[PDB]
Amino acid sequence: GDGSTYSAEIRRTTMGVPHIKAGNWGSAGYGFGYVQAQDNLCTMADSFLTYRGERSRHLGGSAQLVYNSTLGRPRNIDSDFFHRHVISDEAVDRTMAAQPAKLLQMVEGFAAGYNRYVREAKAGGSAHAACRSEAWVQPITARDVWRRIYAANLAGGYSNFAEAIANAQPPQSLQGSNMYGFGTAATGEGSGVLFGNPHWYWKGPDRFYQAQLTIDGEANVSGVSFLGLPVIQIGFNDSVAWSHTVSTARRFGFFQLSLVQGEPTSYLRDGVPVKMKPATITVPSRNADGSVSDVTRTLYHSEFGPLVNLAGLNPALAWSQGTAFAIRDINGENFRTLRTWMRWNQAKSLDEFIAIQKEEASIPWVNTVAVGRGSAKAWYADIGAVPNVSPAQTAACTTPFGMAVGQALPNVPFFDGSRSECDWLTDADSVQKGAVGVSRMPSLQRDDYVGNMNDSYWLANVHAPLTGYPAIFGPAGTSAQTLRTRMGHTMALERLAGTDGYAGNKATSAVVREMVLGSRVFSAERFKDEVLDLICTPAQWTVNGAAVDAAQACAVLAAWDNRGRKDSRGSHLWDEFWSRVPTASLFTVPFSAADPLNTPRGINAAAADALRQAMATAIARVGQSGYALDAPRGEVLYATRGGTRLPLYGGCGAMGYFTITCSENDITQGGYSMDGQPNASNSYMQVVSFPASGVQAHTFLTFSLSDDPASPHHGDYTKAYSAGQWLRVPFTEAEITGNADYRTATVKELE
Amino acid sequence: TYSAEIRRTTMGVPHIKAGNWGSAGYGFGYVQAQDNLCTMADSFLTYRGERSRHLGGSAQLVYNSTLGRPRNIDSDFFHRHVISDEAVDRTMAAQPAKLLQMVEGFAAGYNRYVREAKAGGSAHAACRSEAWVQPITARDVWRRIYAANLAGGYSNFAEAIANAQPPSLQGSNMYGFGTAATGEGSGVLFGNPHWYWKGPDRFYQAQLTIDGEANVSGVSFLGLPVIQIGFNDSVAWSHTVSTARRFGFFQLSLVQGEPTSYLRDGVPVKMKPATITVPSRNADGSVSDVTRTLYHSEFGPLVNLAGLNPALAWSQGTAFAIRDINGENFRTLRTWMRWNQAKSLDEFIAIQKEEASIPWVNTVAVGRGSAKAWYADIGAVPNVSPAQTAACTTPFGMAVGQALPNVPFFDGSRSECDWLTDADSVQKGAVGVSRMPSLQRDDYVGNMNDSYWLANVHAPLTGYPAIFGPAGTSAQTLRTRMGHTMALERLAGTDGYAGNKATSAVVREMVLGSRVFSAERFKDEVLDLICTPAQWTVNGAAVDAAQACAVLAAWDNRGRKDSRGSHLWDEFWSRVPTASLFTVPFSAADPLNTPRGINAAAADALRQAMATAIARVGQSGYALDAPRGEVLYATRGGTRLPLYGGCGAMGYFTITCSENDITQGGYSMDGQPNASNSYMQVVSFPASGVQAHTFLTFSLSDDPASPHHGDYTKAYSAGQWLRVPFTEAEITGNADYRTATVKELE
């Protein structure tokens, strides 16, 4: 025995943020896995059942996943087949074989640290009372952590079709997030300013966990990871800061297979039979009466990827004697993402950040924006792993059956898998086979700003639109932007023009911290006045043959100033109204590429009757909820912690909020509670800059670090977010040890 | 001209007084809408198949009911296909004139309230200005009436019927106590349907007084115009769900190349097509048409059985149809009408046998002057013989028999497999009257949703057709074991209540007692097995069960408002793996006390289940020893009223069964609870005339603004039965009496 031991120093500061300090990558993984489990054991333990495909054994085949995530909530039995079949032992082998030694070590360490905590939770104590005595709270392996890492890569492709892939048998969605990078012409200062605002889960294993990793001599990085991931995915170090938003670029396509007659598990490749590769999978499943029964399916792969049951999309697309369909996710063969975040965690300049992004071409389903100490310009890119097809292919390769989806999935290549000419293409500068070459993926540097709110790359900067990149990246000058995108660029322009009501005309760290929470509602700012002019005089109506007294609703909305702040009165009536306004023929001024933030616009006077119908419904729904029409938003929109409803602000992107606090709960069922599993919402937030004293970051983790109701870090951060009080997260050693709430413990064990 | 006098008393209970059946229907339609417009209006979309047009084809039904909660588009197809214009015509053609009049009046009175809601007011604010609040026709009321009949057969397969293309009903207690049991001049009838707290199948309590014709009080589903469970001056009765199957399947042998024709003794028969178009609203607010062609066989509608088992797909060679006996039963509403007017128990029984129409429930009744109480599962039931079941069940039919025992699954290509008609069958293909179970007893009859076998445990019933359910071969539910136990212990005087007779006053207390059979019988053996020591290792984890052991030992096995720890027992018992739990098997000689005997081998599994129960309670925020009324509650006017009772699965008789997981704010009754205490009645016939005490647990009105949305619920929480006035003098002398007359030209 070589005596190797993991040893990590865990320093926790305010909100319980852990700052792991270790002499090597293994020990850093050991500390990070320990603190993730210490704060989120129940969410994590359940999640490892998902990636191993062991949910059904413990929790019953017919129950749904407990937590929402990039997988959604399929039945346990289908989730188990999906994971076993796509994240097979081969896919894990393949993934691990492409990894640098230091990351294989960090992941072994992470598993050991998770397991150390599991031993502590089994031993005793009051933490994680909700699950600590369950059989599925158990040690895991490094391989399990690689399953989880691989799983994260599939959000843009295979994950969205878990049930469809688990049920492909022979006859025998992703959305959200804002970010800005302001360059030094915008901040007026020696460095740019980075605003990171992923809209994401508040519960479940995809949710973020905030921490710092200090790996002596190699990295000192702070930010967030999904639970179960060992490197920082959105964050900063002494030299660079970055964030991500969902990209419009499709990451998957379909291949239609022409089957061998007599033999529906074989397909033709330029006239030659090729066998599909079978996998007979048995998933053990707990019966409602307590016993366990085996469930066996034989599922299949083609050379493109797994077989996929498309009959749910359209019954014509069943796997028949003549045709079957496969799905290819470009990320299924992309083993490079984890190393890419790793290299960014260690990056010493924006130029280096940029080179890593180009060399790896691995970013799986997101845009990236970054700012680097000493660099005048901010960076925007949708440089990652993306299917490569030419327009010639889209014309010659698309099949009749593909139409049946052509509205449901535009830009997704649905190709004739019979013809090798239809396989995805490889460029001279493609990093991976069948992926777009680096020079053909969009990016921009600007010394004013770049931003993205989940529209295409086109308007990274409104003054310098980007065009001429492959169609798969999304439209470039021909589609209207969403209301959130129009809100997000409007706020950026108004800041630099000094016309948004905040101090000065620079995107300083302090003013950015305020602006990003201001909760303006674009649909109300641009359209509420026209709507009221159109329907509020008279305010006594006939709607569906009923007398409707809209005088109070008209008054409340006229007095409301189009913001969803905690004290704003009537903002929820607007949400209930705007969300019901039929969209056909609503606007008289259509989209103009030369005016993309202010078009479409112009409420159609012919829409008057339908607007009164929608308003009358909205007044009824608010009355049914038991809230007053003029209730303050903080009473409607809230997070409960320690028995107290903490008031919140913000709203849904569909209303044209930029500040996102988007409840899944109907107003009539207790308001817009954030306590269940809300829609993608403000989660980890960071405002980062690089002033003379060193990197400075202000952060929130809105739902708080720990999922355990007994933890002091279950609702402390949430109370700060309710109050609008950004956390100045300590980063230097002196900042960490000088923090008012500093505590340090060391964990160690033999490797 | 319709004219009805509406007198309301305490809790808003309306007592409609009218000179004829049309006007009584007008008054009743008006009050039901006045209290429940939003539920009712939403329901008329359902029965007409017009949900998707207003609410989107993709959305599920808003309310639970006998239909369950399928997508709007499937519901709309089922209703249009099964409740066709022809089905409505046929239903109406079989009706007495006075009931056709009454349903015309009910439509007109509902429409009158619709006019008033549209004109102004703040009642029914939740929906008064929506397009789907709109006048209805008498035919629409008939659609609703027919729909209620299909609960035992078609309604359970609505989606499967809506998607049949070529290539769960449970609950309720009742007792009937005879004069030997009451020690008095009359029996005592206890009616306790466990039913919906929201949606159009929920009960609405009222009296109808129709000049020289009827004077009846009780409940109807919303949309129904006669009293379904109730009493009059001479007879009282109630219903519980019957175990008897009301449907079967016919496996069809398809005609070659013709997957919409089938063979009948070798001759092709064409299925009858219906091309149905349903407008459906899209997510952006436009409306687009959906079209399916669906089919009928001579047995009933084609049905998609691929979901039951993939092998049962409508293929080239085979298809499946479903026959619900109640699809051709047009008699049920006339049957309740005739009971509403009956002048004695003998007449009530004679009506039951004459009509043989009761569609999916048992009946128990007590009559004025009658020594013996009455139990029957006499109603409409498919008639197949043993010979025929052996000769006709197809190889597929045998496989499905395991999940669906006694549902005839027959070869529909053979005319000798058609359902039989006996000499005393009232309807073709239905069981004859002399072959359906009944019993009179001067002590008691009772049923809690097991079969007819133990209507009275001292005199079991045997030998009736298999279709009625098992009678000695299956263990009884814990609720049936608790319900009989309670009746025996009452008459033995060993239940703790006054005397040894089932008087109205004592029965009113006993039925709310909230005893928990699983705890009374098994908690001691559980704690003896697992509580010493109370420090455990469970899946390798140290578990401190000392508080759980102490709280359960101190709990007295009742779910009353003050009982501490009863919710920990719910979280535990519901988790106990049932395979091999009991060492004393079911015995037909001792059906109340078997199976029993907790298997010592289950100790690890019992610890696992208890550890998980402790965990779930901790996650909910409640203490292990919380009083039940804090955990189990109904919110009205912003106050959580404490409740008592529980779920049948634990062996409660007093049923208050939340669908809400305890970690989501406790056992709230505010959403759509599982079948629970709803209308309850304890009725007797003292020398002054019929006396009834009642609850409508969720209150009369679905409108949060109504003074009758929470008043009765506050009473139920307090355990204060309502003495419902019945005579003219009681009604006009009630402390809350108000009267108003509604009239209009016909």
Residue numbers in the entry:
A (entry chain C): 8 to 179, 199 to 777
B (entry chain D): 12 to 178, 199 to 777
Can you list sentences taken from the study reporting this PDB entry?
The recombinant MacQ protein exhibited bifunctional acylase activity against various ranges of AHLs and against multiple β-lactam antibiotics, including penicillin G, ampicillin, and amoxicillin. The MacQ protein is comprised of 806 amino acid residues, including an N-terminal signal peptide, and belongs to the N-terminal nucleophile (Ntn) hydrolase superfamily. AHL-acylase is one of the enzymes capable of inactivating AHLs via hydrolysis of the amide bond of the acyl side-chain to produce homoserine lactone (HSL) and fatty acid.
Unexpectedly, SDS-PAGE analysis showed that the purified SPΔ7 was uncleaved and was present as a single polypeptide chain with a subunit weight of approximately 80 kDa, suggesting that the seven-residue deletion of the SP inactivated the self-cleaving maturation, despite the fact that SPΔ7 possesses the catalytic serine (Ser1β in the cleaved form). Interestingly, SPΔ7 exhibited unambiguous degrading activity against almost all of the substrates tested for wild-type MacQ. We successfully determined the crystal structure of MacQ SPΔ7 in ligand-free form. However, each molecule was determined to be a homodimer composed of two uncleaved SPΔ7 polypeptides. The overall structure of SPΔ7 superimposed very well on that of the wild-type enzyme without its SP region. We could build the continuous atomic model for chain A, while several residues corresponding to the SP region of the wild-type enzyme were disordered for the chain B, and most of the residues of the SP region (residue 179–200) were disordered for chains C and D. The conformation of the SP region of the SPΔ7 (residue 183–202) was found to be completely different from that of the SP in the wild-type enzyme. In the SPΔ7 structure, the ~3.4 Å distance between the main-chain O of Gly202 and the main-chain amide of Val272 would be too distant to form a hydrogen bond. However, the pocket is insulated from the solvent because of the presence of the uncleaved polypeptide chain (residues Leu201-Ser203).
